[PDB]
Protein backbone atom coordinates (compact mmCIF):
# COMPACT_ATOMS: atom_id res chain seq x y z
CA UNK A 1 0.00 0.00 0.00
CA UNK A 2 1.18 3.57 -1.33
CA UNK A 3 -0.12 7.10 -0.57
CA UNK A 4 1.12 9.79 -2.11
CA UNK A 5 2.14 12.98 -0.25
CA UNK A 6 0.74 16.08 -0.02
CA UNK A 7 3.34 19.42 -1.12
CA UNK A 8 3.81 21.80 1.82
CA UNK A 9 2.67 25.28 1.03
CA UNK A 10 4.72 27.53 -0.98
CA UNK A 11 6.93 30.02 -0.70
CA UNK A 12 5.78 33.52 -1.92
CA UNK A 13 7.15 36.88 -1.32
CA UNK A 14 5.48 39.25 1.37
CA UNK A 15 3.29 42.17 0.53
CA UNK A 16 4.69 44.67 -1.88
CA UNK A 17 4.10 48.03 -3.19
CA UNK A 18 4.08 48.93 -7.00
CA UNK A 19 3.45 52.41 -8.40
CA UNK A 20 0.95 52.50 -11.25
CA UNK A 21 3.11 51.70 -14.63
CA UNK A 22 5.43 50.05 -12.77
CA UNK A 23 6.16 46.57 -12.85
CA UNK A 24 4.24 43.72 -10.25
CA UNK A 25 6.27 40.57 -10.47
CA UNK A 26 5.30 37.77 -8.34
CA UNK A 27 7.32 34.52 -8.34
CA UNK A 28 7.62 31.60 -6.07
CA UNK A 29 10.96 30.03 -4.95
CA UNK A 30 9.51 26.23 -4.40
CA UNK A 31 9.53 23.18 -6.57
CA UNK A 32 6.68 21.85 -8.84
CA UNK A 33 5.53 19.90 -10.97
CA UNK A 34 3.01 22.21 -11.62
CA UNK A 35 2.18 25.58 -10.08
CA UNK A 36 -1.32 27.66 -10.17
CA UNK A 37 -1.26 31.19 -9.69
CA UNK A 38 -4.38 33.30 -9.71
CA UNK A 39 -5.73 36.68 -8.75
CA UNK A 40 -7.29 40.20 -9.64
CA UNK A 41 -8.01 41.05 -13.10
CA UNK A 42 -7.94 37.67 -14.73
CA UNK A 43 -4.30 36.90 -13.76
CA UNK A 44 -3.83 33.24 -14.14
CA UNK A 45 -0.44 31.45 -14.61
CA UNK A 46 0.83 27.96 -14.60
CA UNK A 47 4.80 28.96 -13.99
CA UNK A 48 6.92 28.93 -11.06
CA UNK A 49 7.44 33.10 -12.66
CA UNK A 50 4.40 34.45 -14.10
CA UNK A 51 4.47 36.68 -16.81
CA UNK A 52 5.12 40.11 -15.20
CA UNK A 53 2.04 42.61 -15.08
CA UNK A 54 2.37 46.33 -15.58
CA UNK A 55 0.53 47.89 -12.53
CA UNK A 56 -2.76 49.57 -12.49
CA UNK A 57 -5.20 50.05 -9.73
CA UNK A 58 -7.26 47.52 -10.98
CA UNK A 59 -4.28 44.82 -10.43
CA UNK A 60 -4.43 45.97 -6.77
CA UNK A 61 -5.27 42.82 -4.66
CA UNK A 62 -4.73 39.15 -3.39
CA UNK A 63 -2.91 37.06 -5.33
CA UNK A 64 -2.65 33.15 -4.19
CA UNK A 65 -0.52 30.24 -5.30
CA UNK A 66 -0.63 26.32 -4.49
CA UNK A 67 1.89 23.97 -6.24
CA UNK A 68 1.30 19.97 -7.52
CA UNK A 69 3.12 16.95 -7.06
CA UNK A 70 3.99 14.23 -9.49
CA UNK A 71 0.62 12.53 -8.71
CA UNK A 72 -1.17 15.22 -8.59
CA UNK A 73 -1.31 16.10 -5.12
CA UNK A 74 -1.88 19.52 -3.75
CA UNK A 75 -1.07 22.00 -1.44
CA UNK A 76 -2.66 24.30 0.50
CA UNK A 77 -3.53 28.06 -0.88
CA UNK A 78 -0.90 30.57 0.23
CA UNK A 79 -1.14 34.33 -0.87
CA UNK A 80 0.53 37.59 -1.20
CA UNK A 81 -1.16 41.12 -1.09
CA UNK A 82 -0.37 44.06 -3.77
CA UNK A 83 -0.94 47.29 -3.22
CA UNK A 84 -1.00 49.82 -6.11
CA UNK A 85 -0.23 53.18 -5.74
CA UNK A 86 -1.61 55.78 -8.01
CA UNK A 87 0.42 58.25 -9.86
CA UNK A 88 -0.06 61.42 -9.12
CA UNK A 89 -2.08 64.10 -11.35
CA UNK A 90 -0.61 65.89 -14.21
CA UNK A 91 0.09 69.20 -12.86
CA UNK A 92 -0.77 72.06 -15.23
CA UNK A 93 2.23 74.45 -15.90
CA UNK A 94 1.71 78.81 -15.93
CA UNK A 95 4.67 80.67 -16.04
CA UNK A 96 6.27 84.46 -16.63
CA UNK A 97 6.64 83.37 -19.66
CA UNK A 98 6.97 86.73 -21.63
CA UNK A 99 9.83 87.76 -19.52
CA UNK A 100 12.76 90.16 -20.02
CA UNK A 101 16.26 89.31 -19.13
CA UNK A 102 16.96 90.65 -15.88
CA UNK A 103 13.53 89.79 -14.44
CA UNK A 104 13.04 87.07 -12.19
CA UNK A 105 11.53 83.76 -14.16
CA UNK A 106 8.47 82.22 -12.38
CA UNK A 107 7.55 78.73 -12.96
CA UNK A 108 4.58 77.42 -11.08
CA UNK A 109 1.45 74.79 -10.60
CA UNK A 110 -1.69 74.25 -8.45
CA UNK A 111 -1.62 70.82 -8.11
CA UNK A 112 0.00 70.10 -4.78
CA UNK A 113 2.67 67.79 -5.82
CA UNK A 114 4.78 67.30 -2.41
CA UNK A 115 7.80 67.83 -3.95
CA UNK A 116 8.87 69.23 -7.47
CA UNK A 117 11.44 68.79 -9.93
CA UNK A 118 11.63 71.28 -12.96
CA UNK A 119 13.55 70.05 -16.04
CA UNK A 120 14.85 72.53 -18.37
CA UNK A 121 17.00 73.16 -21.10
CA UNK A 122 20.09 71.97 -19.38
CA UNK A 123 18.02 68.55 -18.74
CA UNK A 124 17.54 66.62 -15.60
CA UNK A 125 20.82 65.13 -15.07
CA UNK A 126 21.20 64.02 -11.24
CA UNK A 127 23.88 66.32 -11.28
CA UNK A 128 21.65 69.18 -12.16
CA UNK A 129 18.90 67.40 -10.35
CA UNK A 130 20.55 67.98 -7.07
CA UNK A 131 19.69 67.30 -2.99
CA UNK A 132 16.01 69.06 -2.32
CA UNK A 133 16.17 71.70 0.15
CA UNK A 134 18.09 74.57 -0.20
CA UNK A 135 18.13 76.52 -2.52
CA UNK A 136 18.14 74.26 -5.12
CA UNK A 137 15.92 76.30 -7.93
CA UNK A 138 15.90 72.36 -9.91
CA UNK A 139 14.32 70.88 -6.90
CA UNK A 140 11.79 72.31 -5.00
CA UNK A 141 9.49 71.93 -2.19
CA UNK A 142 6.11 73.12 -3.41
CA UNK A 143 4.65 73.40 -7.60
CA UNK A 144 7.02 76.57 -7.57
CA UNK A 145 10.10 78.05 -8.35
CA UNK A 146 12.27 81.18 -9.18
CA UNK A 147 14.75 81.46 -10.79
CA UNK A 148 17.10 84.38 -11.12
CA UNK A 149 18.24 86.37 -13.54
CA UNK A 150 22.29 85.04 -12.46
CA UNK A 151 21.32 81.90 -12.26
CA UNK A 152 22.76 79.07 -14.72
CA UNK A 153 19.51 77.58 -15.13
CA UNK A 154 17.85 81.00 -16.19
CA UNK A 155 17.42 79.69 -20.20
CA UNK A 156 14.84 80.05 -22.59
CA UNK A 157 13.12 77.08 -24.32
CA UNK A 158 10.93 74.22 -22.62
CA UNK A 159 10.31 73.38 -19.18
CA UNK A 160 7.88 70.96 -17.66
CA UNK A 161 7.70 70.04 -14.02
CA UNK A 162 7.85 66.36 -12.26
CA UNK A 163 5.72 65.76 -9.64
CA UNK A 164 6.71 63.57 -6.55
CA UNK A 165 5.06 62.60 -3.93
CA UNK A 166 6.88 61.73 -0.89
CA UNK A 167 4.96 59.60 1.29
CA UNK A 168 4.44 57.36 -1.88
CA UNK A 169 7.88 57.84 -3.86
CA UNK A 170 4.94 57.89 -7.22
CA UNK A 171 5.73 60.85 -9.72
CA UNK A 172 3.51 62.04 -12.58
CA UNK A 173 4.69 64.62 -15.13
CA UNK A 174 2.80 67.95 -16.36
CA UNK A 175 2.19 69.87 -19.53
CA UNK A 176 5.51 71.64 -21.97
CA UNK A 177 5.33 75.31 -21.36
CA UNK A 178 7.57 77.63 -24.58
CA UNK B 1 -22.27 17.30 -1.14
CA UNK B 2 -23.50 20.03 -3.47
CA UNK B 3 -21.37 23.38 -2.64
CA UNK B 4 -23.40 26.24 -0.56
CA UNK B 5 -24.51 29.52 -3.21
CA UNK B 6 -21.49 31.58 -3.23
CA UNK B 7 -20.88 34.58 -1.98
CA UNK B 8 -21.15 37.74 -4.94
CA UNK B 9 -21.22 41.83 -4.16
CA UNK B 10 -24.64 43.69 -4.04
CA UNK B 11 -26.20 45.98 -6.98
CA UNK B 12 -23.26 48.20 -8.59
CA UNK B 13 -23.99 51.28 -10.89
CA UNK B 14 -20.73 51.96 -12.84
CA UNK B 15 -20.63 55.00 -14.70
CA UNK B 16 -20.18 54.73 -18.95
CA UNK B 17 -16.27 54.25 -18.87
CA UNK B 18 -15.59 52.64 -15.50
CA UNK B 19 -14.38 49.61 -15.09
CA UNK B 20 -17.06 46.65 -13.55
CA UNK B 21 -15.27 44.55 -11.23
CA UNK B 22 -17.01 41.44 -10.02
CA UNK B 23 -15.95 39.22 -7.82
CA UNK B 24 -16.49 36.05 -5.93
CA UNK B 25 -15.11 35.78 -2.31
CA UNK B 26 -15.70 31.69 -2.18
CA UNK B 27 -13.67 28.79 -2.59
CA UNK B 28 -14.32 26.50 -6.02
CA UNK B 29 -12.21 24.05 -8.21
CA UNK B 30 -14.24 25.97 -10.45
CA UNK B 31 -16.23 29.03 -10.48
CA UNK B 32 -18.63 29.61 -13.54
CA UNK B 33 -19.56 33.46 -14.08
CA UNK B 34 -21.68 34.15 -17.40
CA UNK B 35 -23.67 37.43 -18.22
CA UNK B 36 -24.42 40.25 -21.06
CA UNK B 37 -22.54 40.89 -24.03
CA UNK B 38 -20.88 37.52 -24.35
CA UNK B 39 -19.38 38.10 -20.68
CA UNK B 40 -17.87 34.64 -19.59
CA UNK B 41 -15.24 33.83 -17.40
CA UNK B 42 -14.21 30.34 -14.95
CA UNK B 43 -12.47 32.64 -12.07
CA UNK B 44 -12.96 34.09 -9.22
CA UNK B 45 -11.88 37.43 -10.26
CA UNK B 46 -12.80 37.60 -13.64
CA UNK B 47 -11.74 40.07 -16.11
CA UNK B 48 -12.23 43.50 -15.68
CA UNK B 49 -15.27 44.82 -18.48
CA UNK B 50 -14.60 48.65 -18.97
CA UNK B 51 -18.37 49.22 -19.34
CA UNK B 52 -20.65 50.87 -21.88
CA UNK B 53 -24.26 50.74 -22.16
CA UNK B 54 -24.55 47.01 -23.22
CA UNK B 55 -23.11 45.65 -20.24
CA UNK B 56 -25.81 46.60 -17.99
CA UNK B 57 -27.63 43.82 -16.94
CA UNK B 58 -27.82 40.78 -14.48
CA UNK B 59 -24.74 38.78 -14.56
CA UNK B 60 -24.64 35.06 -12.21
CA UNK B 61 -21.98 32.71 -10.93
CA UNK B 62 -21.74 29.07 -9.84
CA UNK B 63 -19.06 27.12 -7.83
CA UNK B 64 -18.03 23.73 -7.93
CA UNK B 65 -16.78 20.99 -5.49
CA UNK B 66 -14.03 18.51 -6.45
CA UNK B 67 -16.46 15.73 -7.86
CA UNK B 68 -18.26 18.51 -10.01
CA UNK B 69 -21.48 18.73 -7.82
CA UNK B 70 -22.92 22.32 -8.45
CA UNK B 71 -24.42 24.89 -5.91
CA UNK B 72 -26.84 26.96 -7.33
CA UNK B 73 -27.51 29.98 -9.20
CA UNK B 74 -26.73 33.63 -7.81
CA UNK B 75 -26.60 36.93 -9.40
CA UNK B 76 -25.26 40.25 -8.66
CA UNK B 77 -26.98 43.30 -11.06
CA UNK B 78 -24.82 45.69 -12.90
CA UNK B 79 -26.58 49.18 -13.63
CA UNK B 80 -24.63 50.89 -16.51
CA UNK B 81 -25.10 54.78 -15.91
CA UNK B 82 -24.91 56.44 -19.23
CA UNK B 83 -22.38 59.75 -20.13
CA UNK B 84 -24.19 63.34 -20.38
CA UNK B 85 -23.88 64.88 -23.53
CA UNK B 86 -20.61 66.35 -25.28
CA UNK B 87 -21.26 70.23 -24.57
CA UNK B 88 -20.98 72.76 -27.11
CA UNK B 89 -19.14 75.90 -25.53
CA UNK B 90 -19.78 79.40 -27.20
CA UNK B 91 -18.26 82.31 -25.51
CA UNK B 92 -17.35 86.09 -26.46
CA UNK B 93 -13.92 85.46 -27.42
CA UNK B 94 -13.48 88.70 -29.25
CA UNK B 95 -13.06 90.39 -25.92
CA UNK B 96 -11.25 93.95 -24.99
CA UNK B 97 -9.65 93.78 -21.46
CA UNK B 98 -12.07 95.17 -19.00
CA UNK B 99 -15.03 93.86 -20.41
CA UNK B 100 -16.81 90.37 -18.70
CA UNK B 101 -15.71 87.00 -19.89
CA UNK B 102 -18.93 84.49 -20.96
CA UNK B 103 -18.65 81.23 -21.76
CA UNK B 104 -21.91 79.51 -22.21
CA UNK B 105 -23.38 76.18 -23.66
CA UNK B 106 -26.68 75.17 -24.13
CA UNK B 107 -26.37 71.37 -22.57
CA UNK B 108 -28.39 71.17 -19.48
CA UNK B 109 -25.12 69.67 -17.17
CA UNK B 110 -26.34 70.12 -13.79
CA UNK B 111 -22.87 71.55 -12.18
CA UNK B 112 -20.11 73.06 -15.01
CA UNK B 113 -16.20 72.46 -14.05
CA UNK B 114 -14.59 75.05 -15.90
CA UNK B 115 -11.35 74.46 -16.82
CA UNK B 116 -8.49 77.31 -18.29
CA UNK B 117 -4.86 78.06 -18.26
CA UNK B 118 -5.02 78.02 -14.91
CA UNK B 119 -5.49 74.22 -15.22
CA UNK B 120 -7.35 72.02 -13.54
CA UNK B 121 -6.75 71.16 -10.15
CA UNK B 122 -8.89 70.61 -7.24
CA UNK B 123 -6.96 74.02 -5.90
CA UNK B 124 -8.63 76.23 -8.71
CA UNK B 125 -11.61 74.08 -8.78
CA UNK B 126 -13.26 74.82 -5.69
CA UNK B 127 -16.84 74.50 -3.79
CA UNK B 128 -19.14 74.21 -6.28
CA UNK B 129 -21.48 77.04 -5.13
CA UNK B 130 -21.13 80.88 -3.77
CA UNK B 131 -18.81 82.94 -6.33
CA UNK B 132 -16.61 80.19 -7.96
CA UNK B 133 -16.50 81.15 -11.10
CA UNK B 134 -14.42 77.92 -12.16
CA UNK B 135 -17.22 75.42 -10.75
CA UNK B 136 -21.11 76.66 -11.24
CA UNK B 137 -24.39 75.76 -11.36
CA UNK B 138 -25.55 75.80 -14.57
CA UNK B 139 -24.11 75.35 -17.67
CA UNK B 140 -22.63 79.40 -17.78
CA UNK B 141 -20.36 81.52 -16.25
CA UNK B 142 -19.42 85.14 -16.17
CA UNK B 143 -15.73 85.94 -15.43
CA UNK B 144 -15.01 89.35 -14.18
CA UNK B 145 -11.92 91.47 -15.66
CA UNK B 146 -10.61 91.96 -12.08
CA UNK B 147 -10.60 87.87 -11.61
CA UNK B 148 -7.70 85.94 -11.55
CA UNK B 149 -9.06 83.48 -14.42
CA UNK B 150 -9.69 86.65 -16.62
CA UNK B 151 -7.18 84.52 -19.29
CA UNK B 152 -6.56 83.70 -22.85
CA UNK B 153 -6.40 80.55 -24.26
CA UNK B 154 -8.09 77.22 -24.57
CA UNK B 155 -11.02 76.78 -21.83
CA UNK B 156 -13.56 73.71 -22.32
CA UNK B 157 -15.81 72.45 -19.46
CA UNK B 158 -16.93 69.83 -17.92
CA UNK B 159 -20.73 68.52 -17.22
CA UNK B 160 -21.48 66.99 -13.83
CA UNK B 161 -24.38 65.05 -13.33
CA UNK B 162 -25.47 65.67 -9.98
CA UNK B 163 -27.67 62.50 -9.32
CA UNK B 164 -25.73 59.81 -11.44
CA UNK B 165 -22.49 61.34 -10.86
CA UNK B 166 -21.68 60.93 -14.22
CA UNK B 167 -19.56 63.57 -16.19
CA UNK B 168 -19.17 64.28 -20.36
CA UNK B 169 -16.37 66.64 -21.58
CA UNK B 170 -17.04 69.40 -24.67
CA UNK B 171 -15.17 70.91 -27.36
CA UNK B 172 -12.54 73.00 -26.89
CA UNK B 173 -12.72 76.76 -27.25
CA UNK B 174 -10.01 79.41 -27.73
Redesign the interface.
Same mark, same amino acid.
Given at each position: IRIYPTPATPNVPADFAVCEGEAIVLTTTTNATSYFW &? !? +?? !???SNLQSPSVVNATL?DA !?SYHLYVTNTWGCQSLDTSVQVTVNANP +?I? @?I &?SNSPICFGDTLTLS %? %? @??CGQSQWIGPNGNSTGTLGTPGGNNVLWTIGSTTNIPSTDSNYLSGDWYMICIDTITGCRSESNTIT
Open positions: &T !G +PN !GFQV !G +PA @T &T %S %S @TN
